[PDB]
Design a protein around this ligand. Structure first.
Ligand SMILES: Nc1ncnc2c1ncn2[C@@H]1O[C@H](COP(=O)(O)OP(=O)(O)O)[C@@H](O)[C@H]1O
Length: 1175
């Protein structure tokens, strides 16, 4: 169907007798076959060889392997698969991505099991790289029995979790990444490395009861994704057996280092391997841990399958680079000095897993029964040269374009077949229009068909470069050849809404008491009820406060002051500290709402709907728009169209595509005749956004111009500044656009980027421009959503959480500063013509530091950059680094965090101990954003003993984790300065002592009281065994979230949604949980009638604390509930509990309901208004 688009076109291409000649030659399986043809013919040749049976194709680099893999999936779909290459060198102390290992093992198991439907269709073409071809592997990797999960299979829970542990699956309390799994009572969550969505399986007894795929963000199940049998393949290329623990204990005996275990060294690694847990960099130790004879990839191919090698010369030339780089990483990582100096393991054994040479792989493939064939673009004498010519590539000069369309017209006039293959979405109709203007009959082909004779067929399919086959009377021309651009290729949100982490000793702020230190969580019984309480230390200095589970909304994690405040006490010292800040925030809210109102009543020309060109400009997008991006463009366009001048923020990570929203909004404002500006803090951003605005808006009468610091004063004084005549439709500029001399003619839209970095004078300038014209800001720092909805009326902010393309996480390595590892990593990043960040914050020595870098890599262009330089030199240096003039940038953290160099994907942090967690995460984030995998090296000095807090900190970032250990604790800090960039106040004085969460909560109070300018807890002490049992929710961090979120639910349907959350996430509700739910609904019923407290004064009586009763309801209390009296002075209603039998007092749901009906009949309504027997 639409799954094999170019199957008909290729099936037509095979009609050429040269490809059929190749099919005949390969049909008898000859020993030597040398083919010669153009590069773009690869997809053809393979597709011919696959007609006689399966085969393995080898490409030079991973990019060519991905390209040919897609081009073959366009004709074969699921039958052709890609055997990926490791992101790490074989002996490097870093493990590759779990997704890569998953794809490798799934592909090998598919090669060993073609009949297995659950793994996929039988293989016909396997495309791989030189690395994966040369990199050996253990022959027992395919024999590892995966964890097969099906609805109805009879299994045993603990055996399943144990088997998952053996397959290098990391156990966590919440599934967030691939290769993870969480264990809950009767429910197993697991994220296989090859599955698109993580799957949750419900066990009952000794067999699975249900299966359903869920989403990572809300952790809620997706019912519209049907889940068949899932095959959980291992996540590492090894098995954690008892033998590998034995040898890890023999090797672990030497280099023991029992005390003061360094994080990244080999005593810790081998110690944890003897303990059985998987650790990073484990694969390199395969020849010593699991010693066998390692075979190559070609053995796992089904017997008889041949091997076609594309451009073998380049395959060899790169192969030498794999062997050299891998050898350098082996010597570097496992030198005598780096293994702790003691009993250095011999490297000869470790050489077993290293890359085999080209000749060894050749003879190993031939001696295994698999022929070795070649396809080379260069002409050879004894080779079978195919009748295939490459496509004419019109460089972009439209005379060549018209000539190409003319040769197409002549070819179809003769009767030959012409096909124009366009992989882009929205570009086929454009080619149809171009052919119509060139007077050529065009037709958008049905996906999977062949071009009809006499008409050119515009087809949507994956192709890079076209191919001309005169033997088949066929001419295939790709969109790439016509436009000179390569089109590479859905997305799931990553909200991850489930953490409010707490560790022992952490500081929290209680609204009614103050700052205190967390201790633990306990449970006490008062009348047969297991109750849960969270404890805090409040300096009296030994006073402990047990906050219950009904008032968790008053607990805010203390953030703000880096220096800790002193814990509060039972006195009245804290209420004042609340009140003064409460008086210090409304001053901010005043400016906020006054800006919103001045914006509301201001006169500004609205923007009409999108003109006809906007569709073509939006469809000229190289990539694919994202759902969050589409909603953001709709909101931005609508706010432009609304008469109120626009003041909208765009929140998203660096590398998520908000700049496209900028260019599209700017274009929309241009189409209505209004010129626009873009304000950036640094000149580098003016150049980047300048080039993006050029490329996206080219081909239209729109002159884009920029005014940076380095724009010469001739063009600056004349062209840019003198453009008050409508000469510029859009100007990208730095702060020079904010001086007095500037002037606009019909300024229509302002685009701000990284508004936080601007100067204060420039900030007040931009805010002054806000009221008069439409503004549109972009931010990489996120904001707390509580502030998003707290200040929603004055300033709308749209969030983008759908990644445009899967940006796989960078590979972090914590370790001692070894020069060989640094040099090896820098040279590996230089191999792909990449760049690297080297961080040495001590400015005094930065020069010397860079010199030492040049000691390690002499062929590296190394430069320095720091904040002490004047901007005229610094921005020029950073410009040189962005223009690839330099290879390694030694800089301080201030300079590094604030650059967007996409080509830089390797980071070296010297003296990583000195940096905080947040700074380390920021540093790491600035690499590995593009299509390339990033690397990060957090290094601590080896000449001094590491500190305790550096050991802990480095340990948190060591095991790369998104958990509540600190990634979330230090994410809040990333939101603090974001708030400072959003709201006007920068002072942290009132934050320190109140808590930033309570600070912006008071901000919420003030701005909600000011927004409505025109307008001008219940305690239940009942003997009801209600709690969330630990067996139901094992993880305390999640159970506290269930408590809090259940308490915060404000209506019955919200409580029901919480119930559905607990049911889906953790399983069916137990009795104490349902009783707690009924207690919450009882709290709502109290709030409707304003009851503050319902407490049992004694074992036989109950008191409703605040009620006034008129004479009618007082008499009704006497008649319907005898024995009870109403005390008007204290204004309480005290009634006695009826005994259950003739004896025990009533409890649990009988008591809850009885109290409900009592409240009802006392407050007018009948006893049959509602029942608490639900849920
Ligand atoms: N939908 C997409 N898929 C893949 N890459 C994209 C997509 N949109 C934009 N990009 C790439 O990512 C970058 C877009 O982000 P950028 O323009 O740097 O602003 P920001 O990083 O703030 O989103 C560009 O370099 C672009 O090539």
């Amino acid at each position: 169907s639409v799954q094999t688009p170019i199957a008909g076109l290729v099936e037509l291409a095979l009609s050429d007798p040269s490809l059929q000649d190749v099919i005949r030659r390969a049909a008898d399986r000859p020993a030597d076959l040398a083919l010669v043809g153009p590069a773009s013919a690869r997809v053809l040749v393979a597709a011919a060889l696959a007609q006689n049976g399966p085969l393995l194709v080898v490409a030079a680099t991973g990019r060519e392997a991905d390209e040919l893999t897609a081009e073959l999936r366009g004709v074969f779909g699921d039958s052709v698969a890609l055997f990926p290459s490791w992101e790490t060198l074989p002996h490097e102390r870093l493990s590759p991505g779990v997704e890569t290992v998953g794809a490798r093992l799934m592909l090998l198991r598919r090669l060993a099991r073609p009949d297995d439907e659950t793994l996929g269709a039988p293989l016909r073409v396997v495309v791989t790289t030189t690395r994966s071809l040369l990199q050996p592997m253990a022959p027992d990797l395919v024999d590892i029995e995966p964890v097969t999960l099906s609805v109805g299979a009879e299994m045993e829970f603990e055996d399943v979790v144990a088997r998952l542990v053996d397959l290098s699956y990391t156990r966590v309390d919440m599934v967030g990444k691939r290769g993870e799994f969480a264990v809950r009572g009767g429910i197993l969550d697991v994220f296989p490395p090859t599955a698109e969505h993580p799957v949750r399986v419900e066990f009952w007894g000794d067999e699975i009861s249900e299966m359903r795929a869920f989403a990572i963000a809300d952790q809620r199940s997706i019912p519209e994704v049907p889940v068949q049998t899932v095959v959980a393949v291992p996540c590492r290329e090894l098995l954690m057996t008892d033998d590998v623990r034995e040898r890890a204990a023999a090797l672990a005996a030497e280099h023991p280092t029992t005390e003061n275990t360094v994080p990244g060294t080999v005593p810790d690694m081998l110690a944890k391997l003897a303990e059985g847990i998987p650790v990073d960099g484990m694969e390199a130790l395969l020849p010593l841990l699991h010693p066998i004879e390692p075979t190559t990839l070609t053995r796992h191919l089904p017997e008889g399958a041949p091997v076609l090698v594309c451009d073998p010369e380049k395959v060899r030339t790169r192969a030498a680079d794999l062997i050299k780089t891998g050898r350098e990483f082996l010597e570097a990582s496992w030198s005598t000095a780096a293994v702790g100096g003691d009993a250095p393991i011999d490297l000869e054994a470790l050489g077993a897993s290293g890359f085999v040479t080209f000749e060894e792989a050749r003879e190993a493939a031939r001696e295994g029964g698999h022929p070795w064939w070649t396809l080379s673009q260069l002409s050879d004498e004894s080779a079978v040269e195919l009748d295939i010519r490459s496509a004419p590539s019109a460089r972009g000069s439209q005379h060549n374009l018209e000539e190409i369309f003319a040769m197409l017209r002549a070819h179809v006039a003769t009767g030959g077949y012409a096909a124009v293959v366009t992989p882009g979405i929205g570009t086929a109709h454009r080619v149809v229009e171009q052919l119509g203007e060139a007077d050529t009959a065009a037709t958008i082909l049905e996906p999977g068909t062949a071009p009809k004779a006499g008409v050119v067929g515009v087809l949507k399919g994956p192709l890079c470069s076209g191919v001309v086959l005169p033997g088949a009377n066929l001419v295939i021309i790709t969109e790439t050849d016509l436009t000179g651009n390569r089109v590479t290729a859905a997305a799931k949100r990553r909200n991850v809404v489930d953490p409010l982490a707490l560790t022992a000793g952490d500081l929290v702020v209680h609204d009614q008491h103050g700052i205190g230190k967390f201790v633990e969580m306990t449970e006490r019984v008062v009348g047969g009820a297991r109750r849960e309480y969270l404890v805090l230390e409040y300096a009296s200095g030994t006073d402990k406060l047990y906050v219950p589970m009904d008032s968790l909304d008053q607990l805010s994690r203390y953030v703000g002051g880096e220096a800790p405040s002193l814990s509060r006490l039972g006195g009245s010292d804290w209420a004042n500290t609340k009140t003064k800040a409460r008086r210090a925030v409304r001053e901010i809210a005043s400016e906020l709402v006054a800006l919103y109102a001045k914006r509301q009543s201001a006169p500004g020309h609205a923007f009409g709907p999108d003109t006809p060109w906007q569709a073509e400009m939006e469809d000229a997008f190289g990539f694919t728009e994202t759902i969050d991006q589409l909603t953001a463009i709709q909101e931005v366009k609508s706010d432009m169209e609304k008469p109120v001048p626009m003041d909208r923020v765009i929140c998203g990570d660096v590398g998520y595509g908000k700049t496209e929203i900028a260019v599209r909004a700017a274009f929309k404002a241009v189409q209505d005749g209004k010129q626009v500006a873009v304000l950036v803090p640094t000149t580098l951003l003016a150049d980047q956004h300048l080039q993006t605005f050029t490329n996206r808006m080219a081909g239209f009468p729109v002159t884009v111009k920029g005014l940076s610091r380095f724009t010469d004063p001739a063009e600056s004084r004349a062209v840019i500044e003198g453009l008050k005549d409508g000469s510029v439709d859009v100007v990208i500029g730095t702060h020079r656009l904010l001086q007095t001399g500037v002037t606009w003619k019909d300024l229509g839209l302002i685009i701000v980027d990284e508004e936080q970095r601007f100067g204060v004078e420039h900030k007040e300038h931009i805010k002054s421009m806000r009221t008069h014209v439409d503004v549109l800001t972009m931010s990489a720092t996120p904001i707390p959503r509580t502030l998003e909805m707290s200040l929603a009326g004055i300033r709308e902010m749209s969030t983008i959480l759908t990644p445009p393309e899967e940006r796989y996480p960078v590979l972090t390595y914590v370790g001692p500063h070894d020069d060989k590892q640094v040099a090896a990593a820098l040279r590996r990043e230089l191999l792909r013509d990449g760049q690297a960040f080297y961080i040495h914050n001590r400015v005094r020595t930065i020069d010397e530091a860079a010199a030492r870098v040049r000691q390690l890599v002499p062929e590296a262009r190394v430069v320095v950059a720091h904040g002490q330089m004047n901007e005229e030199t610094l921005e020029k240096t950073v410009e040189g680094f962005w223009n690839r003039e330099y290879d390694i940038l030694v800089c301080t953290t201030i300079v590094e965090t604030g650059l967007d160099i996409s080509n830089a994907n390797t980071l070296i942090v010297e003296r990583a101990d000195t940096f905080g967690l947040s700074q380390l995460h920021q540093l790491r984030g600035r690499v590995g954003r593009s299509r390339e995998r990033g690397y990060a090296y957090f290094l601590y000095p080896p000449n001094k003993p590491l500190t305790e807090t550096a050991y802990d900190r480095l340990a948190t970032i060591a095991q790369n984790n998104e958990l509540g250990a600190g990634m979330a604790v230090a994410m809040k800090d990333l939101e603090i300065r974001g708030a400072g960039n959003v709201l006007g106040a920068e002072q942290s004085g009132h934050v320190a002592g109140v808590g930033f969460d309570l600070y912006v909560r008071l901000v919420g109070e003030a701005v909600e009281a000011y927004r409505a300018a025109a307008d001008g807890d219940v305690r239940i002490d009942l003997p009801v065994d209600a709690h969330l049992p630990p067996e139901y929710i094992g993880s305390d961090r999640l159970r506290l979230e269930a408590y809090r979120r259940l308490a915060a639910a404000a209506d019955d349907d919200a409580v029901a949604s919480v119930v559905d959350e607990l049911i889906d996430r953790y399983g069916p509700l137990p009795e104490p949980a349902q009783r707690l739910v009924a207690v919450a609904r009882l709290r709502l019923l109290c709030r409707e009638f304003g009851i503050t407290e319902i407490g049992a004064v004694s074992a036989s009586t109950v008191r409703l604390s605040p009620m006034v009763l008129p004479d009618s309801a007082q008499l009704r209390l006497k008649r319907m509930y005898p024995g009870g009296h109403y005390r008007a002075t204290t204004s309480t209603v005290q009634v006695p509990l009826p005994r259950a039998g003739e004896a025990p007092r009533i409890r649990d749901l009988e008591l809850v309901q009885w109290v409900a009906g009592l409240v009802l009949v006392l407050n007018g309504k009948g006893q049959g208004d509602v029942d608490m027997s639900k849920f």
